[PDB]
């Protein structure tokens, strides 16, 4: 129940731990270079072979059941959400066109035996929760006022994902469904672990690379999304402790890069 994993010049300690979930296949680390390009790729090195850390919003009694927060990957690095700063990894990302890598994350909390509640964390693949229904990514300032996302029938039905306006030529239909609904009762299908307040403090997962092509564009890919949801609302005796905090750590594995160029710019 006491173990530590060392990588690069940084290490992480776990006073309690059940193990590491290996997701679909054994030994996710193994991988091979892509096949949709010829130019020689860039591989791992010590500067990027290390962990990174960030912060999330606090947990308060007011939160109700099924509320959730999401952190897209690797878009979190680009957006600098939650104070996460990729440094060398971000710098290398901004100077390439094609990328392919795995992921390996861990989440920790500071629950004590004098609290009751439960948390569920899972790696939902190929989802879009960060974007507003309007069709624009949620800004860091907007993400603060609302600490947790409120579950609703719209999200359950997937009726409010981004779409394209038809135009004056047509008449406006009645939107009722979409292929990106969210089903709270079935989230356990994806790899996950229950962060109960009486059994452990840290959870961790290992996932391989997936995608409908051997490599994906490095400026828009959103294959894996980290999701945290509340099952049992928090409750404790008054005057004991107030509003625990949350943190998480990330680390890429066996990445590849292709298509060198200058720094990315838009317009």
């Amino acid at each position: 129940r006491v173990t530590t994993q060392t990588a690069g010049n940084t290490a992480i300690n776990t006073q309690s731990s059940l193990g590491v979930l290996c997701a679909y296949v054994e030994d996710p680390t193994k991988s091979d270079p892509p096949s949709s390009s010829t130019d020689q790729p860039t591989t791992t090195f010590t500067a990027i072979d290390r962990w990174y850390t960030g912060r999330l919003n606090s947990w308060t009694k007011a939160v109700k059941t099924f509320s959730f927060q999401a952190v897209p990957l690797p878009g979190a690095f680009l957006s600098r959400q939650g104070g996460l700063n990729g440094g060398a990894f971000t710098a290398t990302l901004h100077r390439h066109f094609l990328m392919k890598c795995g992921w390996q994350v861990q989440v920790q909390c500071n629950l004590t035996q004098f609290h009751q509640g439960a948390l569920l964390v899972a790696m939902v693949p190929e989802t879009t929760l960060d974007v507003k229904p309007d069709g624009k990514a949620k800004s860091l300032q907007e993400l603060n006022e609302e600490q947790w996302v409120e579950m609703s029938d719209d999200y359950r039905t997937g009726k409010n994902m981004p779409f394209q306006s038809l135009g004056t030529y047509y008449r406006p239909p009645n939107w009722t469904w979409g292929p990106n609904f969210i089903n709270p009762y079935q989230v356990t299908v994806f790899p996950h672990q229950i962060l109960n307040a009486r059994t452990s403090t840290s959870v961790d997962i290992n996932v391989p690379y997936i995608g409908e092509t051997p490599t994906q564009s490095s400026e828009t890919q959103n294959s894996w999304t980290l999701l945290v949801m509340v099952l049992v609302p928090l409750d404790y005796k008054e005057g004991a402790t107030t509003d625990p905090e949350i943190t998480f750590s990330v680390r890429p594995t066996s990445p590849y890069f292709n298509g060198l160029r200058n720094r990315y710019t838009a317009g």
């Binding site: 693949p125 190929e126 989802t127 779409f163 135009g167 030529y169 047509y170 979409g178 999304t225």
Partner: protein, 255 residues
Amino acid sequence: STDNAETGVIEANTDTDFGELAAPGNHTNVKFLFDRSRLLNVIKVLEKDAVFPRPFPTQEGAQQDDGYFCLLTPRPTVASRPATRFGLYANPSGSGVLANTSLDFNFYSLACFTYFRSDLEVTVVSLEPDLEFAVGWFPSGSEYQASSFVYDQLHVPFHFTGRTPRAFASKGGKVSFVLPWNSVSSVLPVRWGGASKLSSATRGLPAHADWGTIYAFVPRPNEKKSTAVKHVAVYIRYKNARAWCPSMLPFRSYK
């Protein structure tokens, strides 16, 4: 019995607690389940060279021919173009033009994974009595050829001829054939979260996730146009289907 489900990976009949190990007696196999026909969409029948719909947004007063053509994909579509939000016109009479829409109810009732791939087998069935027609199809990323040529002072649409397959069926007949998986993408994303363009893109809208396009027309010259409309039905099948990762299922209301 003793267990720890918080860890996720739980162990695994009545022989463990009290057993019974009922002998086996493979109807759920992925390859077997998805091999059966199902309706996809109903489309009109052409009687002359048509003008393909313009890309969205379409401004008021734009001349085109809508209601024909149809994609080959289970994902929701609108106006014969890929779409994300499925919709329908349950409201009474209104204004403007009504956009045809489609979706594979049966496929999505059990679409419990993310990535999919299989061969497609198309067939066509007529509706009106004693109707004569033909079908045409082209791959993904191609375009429909417009305009017409004159033969003995008869305007024959260009789509009569081409390198792509054509099918002529006898009076009151039926058509069928099997096409190959031809899209550039390695596999079909049931649900997606990327973007197809560097700028001005729409999140979660795939580009070339389909099998092709289909249309129907009558083997007659443009000088014999009629008034009454005609309709056609379409069915599809899947061959050697495969799935690649778990997913969720549609939500059922508790009303």
